[PDB]
Structures are given as C-alpha cells and as structure tokens.
C-alpha cells in the first residue's frame, strides 16, 4: 500500500477511457457482421 | 553528472527541496500557512488533492 | 536426400502464391537435381600381396586418400552410398593393417566434411530457397577450391615419394578445422530450415560463438559479410525508398493490397497494421533494436509516392554489415529522421493537417454558434417531421444557405460538410418515430493523404460529440422561448423555467470552457510539438477521447436520469407552450403539470447529484449550481 | 469514497477491461472465420 493518490486518478481514468475505446469496437463490429 | 543538470535537473531540485521540503524559502509557507489557515483547522474529511490544490496557486 | 523433392515442392508453392503471379520464379531442369556428376563422392580390385610389404600400404593409402579427400573411390579405402542419413561413413580394406587403419579413420572426418558441403553448394543454389541462401551458397565456392589445390600438390608431391602418411596427417590440419566449420553451418540450415532472412541469424550468432577463435572467426566473418548483400540489397530499397522488390518473400517486410475499391477512405477499420507488417520470423536477429524503425520509415515514404509524388532518398550510401559497429544502426536512424520528417512536411505544409483540424470544431464542436442561430432556425420544421418524411437535398441545401449568411462562408474546405442521418438515436450507447432532432448529423469527405488521421473511427466520436451537443443547444432554445411567448403572466412557470435554465445553460457552459477549448489548445500544442504522424494519430486520439469521456458521456448507464432530465425539460417546455398558446391565442389542468413537473425535476436533479457524486476538475459541475441562492440545497446532503 | 476502495476499482476496471477484450478475441477471430 504506497499509492501516492495522483497515480491512482491518473489510473482508473486511463482503465476506463481504454475501455470505452475498446467498448466502442464491440458496437459497430458485431453489426458489421450481421447487418 | 553533466545531463543529470543539463537534461535532467539535479542540484537545482536540490536547492527547491531545501525550499519547499525543509521549509526553507521562507516566503511561501509564510503566507500559505496564512491563506489556508481554515483549512489547517476545517475538517473536511474528503476534500481530497484535488481540492486542496488551488489553495496552492493562489497562494504562489 | 530423397525427401528434397517434396522440400523443395511446398517451397515452391510458399514463394509462388505470396509473390503474385505474373510472371513465375525460375526454376532449373531436372536433370541439375538428377546427375551424380555434380556431387562430390562419386557414385554407382585391392589385389592384395599377403599384404606383405609396409611401405607399400601407407604409399597406397595415401594414394586413395588423395582421391577419396576430393569425393572419389579408392581401390583400398573407399566410400558407402549411405548418404541417406546426414552424414556419410566410409569402408576401409578390412585386411589393412591397424595403426594404420586407425591414422587413416582419424584423418577421413575431412572428407566427409567436404562431401556434405559440395551438396549444400549445388543444392541451395536453386531459385526457391530466396536471395540470401545462393549467396552463401555462393561464398563457400572459394574454400573448395582452396581445398582442391590443396589436394593436387600433395599428389604431385606423392609421385615424388617425398610425401607419407604421417606428412600428410601434418598438412591437413588446417583444412580439417575449416570444413567442419563450413559442414557444422550447412547442417544447421538444412535442418533450421532458415529458407530466407533468418540464415543471417545462424551466422551472426555462430560468428559471435568464435569470437575466441580468430583463425576460424574470419571464415565465418567472411560468410556473414558475403551472404548477406542481397538481404541489405532489398533493406536499403525499403528504407531509402517506399518500394519493395522482394522476388520472393524472405524481407522483414511484407505489403497487403489493402486498400482496393472495398474501402477507399477507411471505413472504419484496421488500415496500416494490416497494410504493411514485420514477418516476425524474417527477422535476422540483430536489428530489432529499430525493426518499429525500418517498418515506419517505409510506410511513411511509400505514403508519400503514392500522395506527394517524391521518391528522394536521403543519402542511399551501403548498410554494408561488420560485427560490433552502428554504422547500420545510425543510417536507419538518418533513413527515419528524413523519412518521418518529409511526411510530416507533407501532411502539415499544404493541405495541412491543422487548417483541415480548424474547420472541423467550427461545425462539430459548434465553437462557430453563429452558424446554428441559422441553420437550425431554418431546418427545424422540416426537422419535426419523423425520419423518412424527410427531404435530404432540400436539407443539403439549407446547409449551404445558412453557411452563406453565417461567419463560416470564409473557410476552402467549408464544401465538405454533408448532412447524414443516424438511426438508433442518443440511445445508441450499449419505437422509431422520434426523429430530426434525434436522428441529425454532420459528417466530412476525406482523401488519401489525410484518410490516414481523420477517418471514420475519429469522425464517428466527433458525430457523438455532436450530437449531445446539438441535442443541448436544442432544448434550451425552446427553453429560452417560453418567456418571449409569455410576455395571466403565471409566476410560478417563470420561476420553474429559471430553474430549468440554469441546469441547462451551465451544463452547456461546462463542457466547451471546461473540455473542449482547454483540452482542444493542449492537443494544438501536441501537434506542433509532435515530431511524426504516430505521434500526432496518439495526440488526436487521446483529445478525442478525453473531450468524450467527460462530457457525461461513457459513463456506465448514460448517468442515466440525465436522458430523463432532458425528456422532462422537452416535455415540459412542449405542454408550456402549448399551455399559454390556449390560455390566451385550462389553469385547472395546467397547475398539474407545474406540480408534478417541480416534482419531477426536484427528482431528477438531485438524483443527478446524488449520481455522480460516486466521483467527488469533475467537480466543477456543482461549482456553478452551488454557487449562490441555493436550491440545490433543498437535499440534505446522501 | 474510501483508501480501502481506491486499489478495488483498480481490480474491477482491469478485470473489467479484460472481460471486455475476452470477447472481440472472438469476435475478431469471427471475422476471419467468416469468409
């Protein structure tokens, strides 16, 4: 336990835009095979 | 021991260190201490970094 | 041996269907693989005295050994047609006398190291096996001569009588450690099967094995030095050019015809790691300090023939290879620092990159207003109508109408806004009949120069933006209308619409003053601080993704009650007007929707508090609501 | 909000990042096992 608090809202910030950015391939690749 | 000061900084982070974290530049904490004297006392319990940075700028 | 056939049958197919087809490969005729003449060791009396005089049988040992070191039968000591394993035996005389049989099977490991390279000579000349392998195939012509001379003095001193057996095993010496040097390095071939670029790997590292060994470190000093000019040959066309003259496939390098009439701008998916790609076994095993380098530097001038005409080298002196030294290493470096660079010039001189940028947020990030007090004013009740009642080009040329009276009729690329629909609406985020407000977008034209940067995976997330954008400055119009349409002067639906107003004017004033605009200068500083375009697509994505993920949007359920905070303040604003049309142009049924829809939106905006407060910068959004007279302030606090 | 929670949403968002790639695994695959 030595999170200085700054590296950790540096963190879930970066976990949950990369994860959008992967979400967002979900949505329009599943159609683009059933469209 | 040159790029560790002409890339990278060394003895000048040195010299802000002994300023900021020895206490020794006698000017900022000196009037810091006056700007965030109710927050030295008020508990609030999860105003947390982010909150208690602007107090810094304007103190600087 | 026998399976050389089929070995080389898949190797043809290997090289032939990657290599389009135009024109073949070249192979040899079969009677090159089929002749015994070619080989070494030859292939389908003794008269012994009581073997009785001594000297006799050393001089006749020797005499066949000096056929038999050059791969031809004795008529004592001879050769088995065992060739069938990897590494051939010999019979000897079996009444030939010991001691001298044994020196004898001591010295015969050097024609066996001969024999097993005279076959990977011939053999791995054939155009299957790509460049690299005929070259080293090719340098290792010299040490059979050498050996060859070698062999014909020693006979010629043998007719003299002035040679003998233990002479002979003297003069071998040397040869016997430099064929098994050669021998134990076709082996390793042969059964590594490196058939392209990655040969240089077994003899760079074999070379760095002998650096203890100086007499044997320049043999293979040599080799490495020589086979590998064709594989430099191809390096140097892709990296001082965009070109790539593989006449197989052995390179690091390989091309995909991509980008044909299925996707010309890129349709939303996987260009470049797709267009260009490092075959990861054709890697020579000392360059992948750059091997990023080498693929970008390529990538990067073959997009510049194709888009800007130039295909200028740098400088195009020889990656000539020497052990240790970076001369290579500096050269990829110079080849990438001009290769990036160009590009870059290419993309930010002229039809550069950022006016191109500019022009987009005046539309989509709506920084240009003055375009929409129009556009939408014309467009909005063609826009009430549902979706395929619509009239698209009496749309388009609203847009284009708007843009004439509009500030924005000063830009040159201004002609590539189009309108588009999208169906599925602000509920897209994992009926039909709501539309035009719903169902509305801009969208751009792009070409293959900037294709590369402004595609469908960015423009996608700029329509998004957009469209909660539009959305906003939807609603609050008809907010703002309410009090004009006013002018019984009921207090109570004045006071209600401040209320509204002030949740949706400053969500409004939060995300262009608090995201866009800020985060819009730090990616203008990015760009002009971005050394290549990799840097530029990562400074783009990343403002990209940082203007949507805080403004609400990615959040897990749509912050969900703000979607009901916008359809009451519509319907809301929808029975106002429709109210003080009729009370004037019952108070009975009205007072009804102002208390429940105080009610509701008490609920909805203090459940939108309570929802985001999970996340404590992003504190802003309560810092004009909590600012003063607070009514924020009818919660007690979680 | 709580220290006790910071290193917590770390492990749900990666974990939760991971569940969202052990899928379009699949779904990219699919689109080669398409055609």
């Given at each position: ?35 | ?43 609030a ?10 107090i ?5 | 041996?026998q ?29 090159v693989?089929?002749r015994?003449?070619?080989?070494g ?9 009581g ?44 009444n ?19 024999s ?18 005929h ?8 040490l ?14 043998h ?5 003998s ?26 059964k ?30 040599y ?28 390179f ?6 991509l ?6 701008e ?15 076994q054709?890697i020579?095993?000392?360059l ?10 390529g ?17 195009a ?10 001369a290579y ?11 990036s660079?160009?590009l ?11 006016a ?9 990030l ?124 009921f207090?109570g ?16 004033y ?16 990015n760009?002009?601080?971005?050394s ?7 400074h783009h ?7 949507l ?41 009205f ?17 939108l508090?309570?929802?985001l ?26």
């Amino acid at each position: 336990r030595a999170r200085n608090m700054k590296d950790f809202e540096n963190q879930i910030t970066e976990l949950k835009k990369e994860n959008f950015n992967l979400k967002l391939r979900i949505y329009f690749l599943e159609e683009r095979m059933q469209q | 021991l040159d790029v560790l000061n002409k890339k990278y900084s060394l003895l000048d982070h040195m010299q802000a260190m002994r300023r900021y974290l020895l206490l020794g530049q006698g000017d900022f904490i000196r009037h810091l201490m006056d700007l965030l004297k109710p927050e030295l006392v008020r508990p609030a319990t999860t105003l947390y970094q982010h909150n208690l940075t602007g107090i810094l700028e304007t103190a600087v | 041996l026998q399976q050389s056939l089929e070995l080389k049958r898949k190797m043809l197919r290997d090289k032939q269907n990657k290599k389009n087809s135009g024109q073949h490969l070249p192979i040899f005729p079969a009677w090159v693989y089929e002749r015994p003449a070619l080989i070494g060791d030859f292939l389908i009396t003794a008269l012994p005295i009581g073997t009785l005089p001594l000297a006799s049988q050393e001089s006749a040992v020797v005499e066949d050994l000096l056929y038999v070191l050059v791969g031809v039968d004795g008529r004592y000591v001879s050769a088995q047609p065992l060739a069938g394993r990897q590494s051939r035996t010999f019979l000897v005389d079996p009444n030939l006398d010991l001691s001298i049989r044994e020196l004898v099977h001591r010295i015969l490991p050097v024609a066996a190291s001969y024999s097993a390279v005279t076959r990977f000579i011939e053999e791995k000349s054939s155009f299957e096996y790509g460049q690299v392998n005929h070259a080293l195939a090719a340098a290792m012509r010299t040490l059979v001569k050498e050996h060859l001379i070698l062999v014909s003095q020693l006979e010629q001193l043998h007719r003299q009588g002035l040679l003998s057996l233990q002479k002979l095993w003297f003069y071998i010496q040397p040869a016997m450690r430099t064929m098994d040097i050669l021998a134990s390095l076709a082996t390793s071939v042969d059964k590594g099967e490196c058939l392209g670029g990655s040969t240089l790997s077994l003899l760079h590292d074999r070379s760095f094995s002998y650096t203890g060994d100086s007499q044997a470190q320049e043999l293979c000093l040599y080799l490495t030095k020589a086979a590998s000019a064709p594989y430099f040959e191809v390096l140097e066309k892709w990296i001082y050019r965009g070109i790539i003259h593989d006449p197989y496939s052995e390179f690091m390098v390989e091309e995909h015809e991509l980008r044909k009439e299925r996707i010309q701008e890129d349709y939303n998916d996987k260009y470049w790691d797709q267009r260009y790609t490092i075959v990861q076994q054709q890697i020579p095993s000392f360059l992948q300090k750059m091997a990023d380098k080498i693929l970008s530097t390529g990538k990067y001038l073959n997009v510049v023939r194709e888009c800007g005409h130039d295909v200028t080298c740098p400088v195009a002196k020889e990656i000539i290879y020497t052990l240790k030294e970076r001369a290579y290493v500096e050269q990829i470096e110079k080849a990438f620092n001009y290769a990036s660079k160009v590009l870059l010039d290419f993309l930010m001189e002229e039809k550069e990159l950022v006016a191109h940028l500019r022009s987009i947020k005046r539309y989509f990030l709506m920084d240009q207003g003055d375009f929409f007090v129009h556009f939408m004013d014309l467009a909005e009740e063609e826009l009430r109508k549902p979706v395929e009642d619509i009239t698209p080009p009496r749309l388009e040329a609203l847009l284009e109408l708007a843009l004439r009276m509009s500030t924005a009729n000063t830009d040159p690329f201004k002609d590539d806004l189009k309108i588009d629909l999208m169906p599925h609406d602000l509920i897209t985020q994992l009926e039909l009949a709501l539309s035009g407000l719903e169902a509305f977008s801009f969208d751009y034209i792009v070409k293959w120069p900037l294709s590369l940067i402004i595609n469908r995976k960015a423009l996608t997330r700029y329509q998004m933006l957009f469209r909660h954008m539009f959305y906003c400055k939807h609603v609050e119009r008809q907010l703002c209308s309410v009090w004009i349409s006013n002018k019984q002067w009921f207090a109570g639906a004045f006071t209600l619409r401040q209320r509204m107003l002030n949740f949706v004017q400053n969500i409004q004033y939060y995300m262009m003053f608090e995201v866009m605009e800020p985060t819009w200068h730090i990616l203008e500083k990015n760009l002009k601080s971005a050394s290549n375009i990799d840097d530029v697509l990562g400074h783009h994505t990343g403002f990209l993704d940082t203007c949507l993920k805080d403004c609400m949007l990615t959040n897990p359920e749509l912050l969900k009650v703000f979607s009901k905070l916008m359809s009451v303040c519509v319907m809301f604003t929808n029975c106002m007007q429709k109210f003080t049309q009729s009370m004037k142009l019952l108070v009975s049924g009205f007072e009804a929707t102002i208390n429940k829809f105080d009610k509701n939106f008490s609920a909805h905006l203090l459940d939108l508090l309570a929802r985001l407060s999970i996340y404590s910068g992003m504190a802003s959004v309560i810092s004009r609501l909590d600012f003063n007279g607070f009514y924020t302030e009818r919660l007690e606090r979680l």
